[PDB]
Amino acid sequence: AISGDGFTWLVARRQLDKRAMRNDMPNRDIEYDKLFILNTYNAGTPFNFSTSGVMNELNNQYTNMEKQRAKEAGNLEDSEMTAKQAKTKFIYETQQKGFSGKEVSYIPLLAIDASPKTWLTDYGVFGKREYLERVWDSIEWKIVESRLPQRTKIQ
Amino acid sequence: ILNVVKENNDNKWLAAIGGFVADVVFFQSPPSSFNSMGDFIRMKTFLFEILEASMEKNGSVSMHARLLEPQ
Amino acid sequence: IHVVPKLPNSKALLQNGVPNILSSSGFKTVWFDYQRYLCDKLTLATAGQSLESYYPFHILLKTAGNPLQSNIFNLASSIHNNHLFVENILPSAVEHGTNSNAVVKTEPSRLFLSKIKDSFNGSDWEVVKEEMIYRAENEVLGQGWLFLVENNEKKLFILTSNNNGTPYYFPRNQSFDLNSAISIDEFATLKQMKELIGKSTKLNGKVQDWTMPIICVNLWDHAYLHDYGVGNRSKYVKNVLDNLNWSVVNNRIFSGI
Amino acid sequence: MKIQTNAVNVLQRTSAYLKSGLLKETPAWYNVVASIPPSTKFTREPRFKNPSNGHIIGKLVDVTEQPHANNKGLYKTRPNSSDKRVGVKRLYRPPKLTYVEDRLRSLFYKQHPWELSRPKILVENEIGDENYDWSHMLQIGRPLDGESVIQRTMYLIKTKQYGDMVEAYDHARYEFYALRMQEETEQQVALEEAEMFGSLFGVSAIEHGIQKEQEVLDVWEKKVVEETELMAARTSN
Amino acid sequence: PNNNDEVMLLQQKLLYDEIRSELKSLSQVPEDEILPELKKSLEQDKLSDKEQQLEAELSDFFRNYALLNKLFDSTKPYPNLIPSANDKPYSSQELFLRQLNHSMRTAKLGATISKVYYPHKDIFYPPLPENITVESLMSAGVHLGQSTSLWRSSTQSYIYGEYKGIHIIDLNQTLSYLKRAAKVVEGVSESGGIILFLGTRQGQKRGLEEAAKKTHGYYVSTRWIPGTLTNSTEISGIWEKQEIDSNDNPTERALSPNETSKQVKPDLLVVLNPTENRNALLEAIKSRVPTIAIIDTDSEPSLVTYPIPGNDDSLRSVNFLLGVLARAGQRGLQNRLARNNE
Amino acid sequence: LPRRIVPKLATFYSANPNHEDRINRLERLLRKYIKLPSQNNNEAQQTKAPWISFDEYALIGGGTKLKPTQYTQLLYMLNKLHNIDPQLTNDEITSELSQYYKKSSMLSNNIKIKTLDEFGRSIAVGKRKSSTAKVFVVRGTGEILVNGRQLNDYFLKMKDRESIMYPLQVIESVGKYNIFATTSGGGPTGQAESIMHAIAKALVVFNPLLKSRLHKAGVLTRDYRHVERKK
Ligand SMILES: [Mg+2]
């Protein structure tokens, strides 16, 4: 489905959304709840811990800057700018929370390149699916199993 | 939210989300706009979280939601 | 069914490619193969629906505001953009197949060079070309399109799109790559655009944009890799902008006669 | 209504006007109609075959053609009452056209009710242009829908790859699921990829529904209030 | 290359606006401010040989083109556009013309469309009768008859079968009847006869008007006045007639009142919806006017000279059959105008 | 060479061949120029629509056959073509529409702009019942004279005095003008209201932008009521 540059990742959600003493135990912190598939585009990363919230953070700067310019103008807030910005911020937050906490990270296990650079030379314009079929028949599952964290058997 | 009182005999209210009627489970308490609005509760829009969606043999979709309230 | 348009002097194009830009193999990839690939996918996506009777430009406008028709929009935008690129880089728009014409010296018109000076603070065409090459290299990390556009205020400016971004409709220009980091100034532009789209009263949530392209350069790997290779896309854009067909580019500027 | 005579004999009635001299000048249509005679039989015509299924109409199976015993274990030795009733009416009644594909079409949409929600255009383009190779399900010019499955099933049974219609149908159904899953992903991913490059959309489908529901719920609020006040006054009586 | 030519005009146009704007400024100033001071200058000035040249050259130039002239006598596209200043943004009208320029050149780039039905082309690009197939008739819906409950059993011989609670018309017969009907229209057109196209169902006017135009015929889309043919002198005598040559050009000869009251009877009547036009059909019979009509499964075939079995309820089916008949008439007209030339 | 007599109009066999032919001509124009945008001054309600009367159109549109709804259909198409943007219109449209404009070009208007006289006075006449009043309004300080006499002397009823002041009260200019009113005929009420009507008509010269407010207050409407002989 990816039209241009990107990657399809086989990831493993890290069950360490506590954030307390995080990244201090290479086994207690390396535990995977469930596996997922994720698509990244151009130079996007599959981790999601170093980039989640970026838009929410920039959104809060914009509102504060606009609110401070409004104070200079001398305005009586607004009927629905405090209720719209609030909703935009409340949704931005609720959509990035984790099961317990808001520290959701992912452990790369596999990655398939979608960029035409990889498959255009050998397979042609019409052979992306042929490329992806031969990619599946060329995956060394040993390397992937190696990257796999240990299951979080909280159950 | 369609009803201002949980479905009789059931511990869940009913919501109208995207052309489907779902069963909404609340975190702990029911927002106070319920009692205030009353039978006109359907006149207001709330934000929900869709937990899961199942399919029954009658050909219906069993959508379970959660009344996300501003906090 | 959407079919690939026939191009003037197609026998020459299949033998000697486009002189000074693409070879025969390079042109077969960009047009004879990719355009066939796009049209077939568009037909499969739109056959049996009302969109089948509309030209690609109209399809993208009709679907620009529909989130779940983005796949159709991407195909329509790419098809329209590719023929905008292949049209202004073509040796001759007129079919001199039986006239065997080998003298096509097209140069920027006076109206084009007058609008360039007006819109770029007196910069010359050569300087603007350097800015266009720079903008492509720093703003389009992967696939995309480079456009020289004209707005409702008679001002020529440079627009770059990521993947299949239309120049006509600013909500779908796709000029900001949100996979990477953005400055507060870029977020302000996005926030202002969102406000404009919310002021529209139409139930389709659509706005009016009268921007029109003047020059189109394909920045996809289907156009340069085979002949230039990874990393040499700036040498490709330089050749394209130096060998444009100005009979087509001049006709795209509204004169009013 | 009686079979009219005067509409098809305009030439003969006109010819009497011209021969007698009541009409001096020959009409412009006169020569044209003379060269192209109207059809004037207006008869009912028998039919001996159903064009859809090739069933023969008007054939009686004689007792000599049923030598073996029936499902009840009895031989047929004499014509039955049905065999002795004249069946001329069947020759003239327009035959009911039937198709095996109709049975599969009803099955497909009973198994997949939501395929009905995908709009279908009944307006034809040009039936004569359809050049389809049903070795594959996808075709250039037509959508992927239930009919793609039915035509694929018929090709399988026609090529004798499968013997039972059910097996061919199941084989076609899975080909249909694969194509439907690839399209559901192309649309989800295309939306996701566009938002990641700064695409903005005014109203989503979910938002469109909320707005329409509000318009209706606002009129409903007024009427409810009005009708909950007339009741109070009327009940006070 | 030649832009300067237009620039030269614009310069004058701008100058003209400046001259006019300050002509109106002096129309407000009181005469007491200008006149006495102006006259005083002349009282303090002495005319020179050259000044006098214009004293009489302008007097004649103003006594020739302003006073002793005839006030009356006994850029081609959009010539009234007011262009905006080169610094100002495009006006609403200019944006419309700027979009029209895009629509002609760019708007159709990327793909061509094949094998797609466009409704208007049925009227403007009808096929010839010899190129019509069963597929084409079926694509237009001509085979879809009425409910089997509404069957007029006199149509039995046209029926192919019943399907989905309706009778299916046999298109093989429709094609043969259509070809016969088309030849009749062509014959009457080539002979110079009056062809009237009658259809009173909503939406048929466009097809009816074009059919009449391309056959040099006549049409009625609103209402058939009962008696138009049998009581023609009380209904149509007042309307104007004209004399025409073999090329269908008005001779311009004035017509005697005797010639302008005579009944003008159609040579051929085409009826799109005969079930609602019994009056017209019976008048045609009484008046010995041959008729063509689309006969649906509930319609009486014997009421018309040349029936065409087919769906009469769909505008596509009707306009498809009307288009074929209209083009057949056109070919007859073109063959008559050609034999006159040679 | 051979000649024949044929109906002039393609719509000959219709109920009204003349009206249908004219409608077809206008419909062709509306089809050929479907794209041309319409006036945005239509929101500004441009006051131009001089179309011929139903009776005048009956001379060319079938006479007795002409039906009111047919005339209504003609106006809906004449206005639509007329309302095309003036800059983007063409000669063809205007040529077709010219035949439908009410002919009022050979004749001229009978209204000359009213202006203050040599002494800065606005003179207007008013009538009520049998009374008449000729007032001279000039810029001043609120001095009024009725037939050379003080207002309180000539008009004893305060309601009559209040009627005279009302037009000046509408434009809030009671202390900005001197009124020299001369009245004759009828009684106190007719004369007071005739002066009221004449002041309102004389105030429009000083500021023609206030005519709409004067009309809305009702002081520019000549009261028609008079003593009626019983019938
Ligand atoms: Mg019918």
Curated annotation (Swiss-Prot), chain A:
<comment type="similarity">
    <text>Belongs to the mitochondrion-specific ribosomal protein mS43 family.</text>
</comment>
<comment type="function">
    <text>Component of the mitochondrial ribosome (mitoribosome), a dedicated translation machinery responsible for the synthesis of mitochondrial genome-encoded proteins, including at least some of the essential transmembrane subunits of the mitochondrial respiratory chain. The mitoribosomes are attached to the mitochondrial inner membrane and translation products are cotranslationally integrated into the membrane.</text>
</comment>
<protein>
    <recommendedName>
        <fullName>Small ribosomal subunit protein mS43</fullName>
    </recommendedName>
</protein>
<comment type="subunit">
    <text>Component of the mitochondrial small ribosomal subunit (mt-SSU). Mature yeast 74S mitochondrial ribosomes consist of a small (37S) and a large (54S) subunit. The 37S small subunit contains a 15S ribosomal RNA (15S mt-rRNA) and 34 different proteins. The 54S large subunit contains a 21S rRNA (21S mt-rRNA) and 46 different proteins. mS43 forms a heterodimer with mS42, building a large protuberance adjacent to the mRNA channel exit in the mt-SSU body.</text>
</comment>
From Swiss-Prot, chain B:
<comment type="function">
    <text>Component of the mitochondrial ribosome (mitoribosome), a dedicated translation machinery responsible for the synthesis of mitochondrial genome-encoded proteins, including at least some of the essential transmembrane subunits of the mitochondrial respiratory chain. The mitoribosomes are attached to the mitochondrial inner membrane and translation products are cotranslationally integrated into the membrane. bS1m functionally interacts with the 5'-UTR of mitochondrial mRNAs.</text>
</comment>
<comment type="subunit">
    <text>Component of the mitochondrial small ribosomal subunit (mt-SSU). Mature yeast 74S mitochondrial ribosomes consist of a small (37S) and a large (54S) subunit. The 37S small subunit contains a 15S ribosomal RNA (15S mt-rRNA) and 34 different proteins. The 54S large subunit contains a 21S rRNA (21S mt-rRNA) and 46 different proteins.</text>
</comment>
<protein>
    <recommendedName>
        <fullName>Small ribosomal subunit protein bS1m</fullName>
    </recommendedName>
</protein>
<comment type="similarity">
    <text>Belongs to the bacterial ribosomal protein bS1 family.</text>
</comment>
Curated annotation (Swiss-Prot), chain D:
<comment type="function">
    <text>Component of the mitochondrial ribosome (mitoribosome), a dedicated translation machinery responsible for the synthesis of mitochondrial genome-encoded proteins, including at least some of the essential transmembrane subunits of the mitochondrial respiratory chain. The mitoribosomes are attached to the mitochondrial inner membrane and translation products are cotranslationally integrated into the membrane.</text>
</comment>
<dbReference type="GO" id="GO:0005743">
    <property type="term" value="C:mitochondrial inner membrane"/>
</dbReference>
<dbReference type="InterPro" id="IPR016939">
    <property type="entry name" value="Ribosomal_mS23_fun"/>
</dbReference>
<dbReference type="GO" id="GO:0005739">
    <property type="term" value="C:mitochondrion"/>
</dbReference>
<dbReference type="GO" id="GO:0005763">
    <property type="term" value="C:mitochondrial small ribosomal subunit"/>
</dbReference>
<keyword id="KW-0689">Ribosomal protein</keyword>
<dbReference type="GO" id="GO:0032543">
    <property type="term" value="P:mitochondrial translation"/>
</dbReference>
<dbReference type="Pfam" id="PF13741">
    <property type="entry name" value="MRP-S25"/>
</dbReference>
<protein>
    <recommendedName>
        <fullName>Small ribosomal subunit protein mS23</fullName>
    </recommendedName>
</protein>
<comment type="similarity">
    <text>Belongs to the mitochondrion-specific ribosomal protein mS23 family.</text>
</comment>
<comment type="subunit">
    <text>Component of the mitochondrial small ribosomal subunit (mt-SSU). Mature yeast 74S mitochondrial ribosomes consist of a small (37S) and a large (54S) subunit. The 37S small subunit contains a 15S ribosomal RNA (15S mt-rRNA) and 34 different proteins. The 54S large subunit contains a 21S rRNA (21S mt-rRNA) and 46 different proteins.</text>
</comment>
<keyword id="KW-0687">Ribonucleoprotein</keyword>
Swiss-Prot record, chain E:
<dbReference type="InterPro" id="IPR023591">
    <property type="entry name" value="Ribosomal_uS2_flav_dom_sf"/>
</dbReference>
<comment type="function">
    <text>Component of the mitochondrial ribosome (mitoribosome), a dedicated translation machinery responsible for the synthesis of mitochondrial genome-encoded proteins, including at least some of the essential transmembrane subunits of the mitochondrial respiratory chain. The mitoribosomes are attached to the mitochondrial inner membrane and translation products are cotranslationally integrated into the membrane.</text>
</comment>
<dbReference type="Pfam" id="PF00318">
    <property type="entry name" value="Ribosomal_S2"/>
</dbReference>
<keyword id="KW-0496">Mitochondrion</keyword>
<dbReference type="GO" id="GO:0005739">
    <property type="term" value="C:mitochondrion"/>
</dbReference>
<comment type="subunit">
    <text>Component of the mitochondrial small ribosomal subunit (mt-SSU). Mature yeast 74S mitochondrial ribosomes consist of a small (37S) and a large (54S) subunit. The 37S small subunit contains a 15S ribosomal RNA (15S mt-rRNA) and 34 different proteins. The 54S large subunit contains a 21S rRNA (21S mt-rRNA) and 46 different proteins.</text>
</comment>
<keyword id="KW-0689">Ribosomal protein</keyword>
<dbReference type="GO" id="GO:0005743">
    <property type="term" value="C:mitochondrial inner membrane"/>
</dbReference>
<dbReference type="GO" id="GO:0003735">
    <property type="term" value="F:structural constituent of ribosome"/>
</dbReference>
<dbReference type="InterPro" id="IPR005706">
    <property type="entry name" value="Ribosomal_uS2_bac/mit/plastid"/>
</dbReference>
<keyword id="KW-0809">Transit peptide</keyword>
<protein>
    <recommendedName>
        <fullName>Small ribosomal subunit protein uS2m</fullName>
    </recommendedName>
</protein>
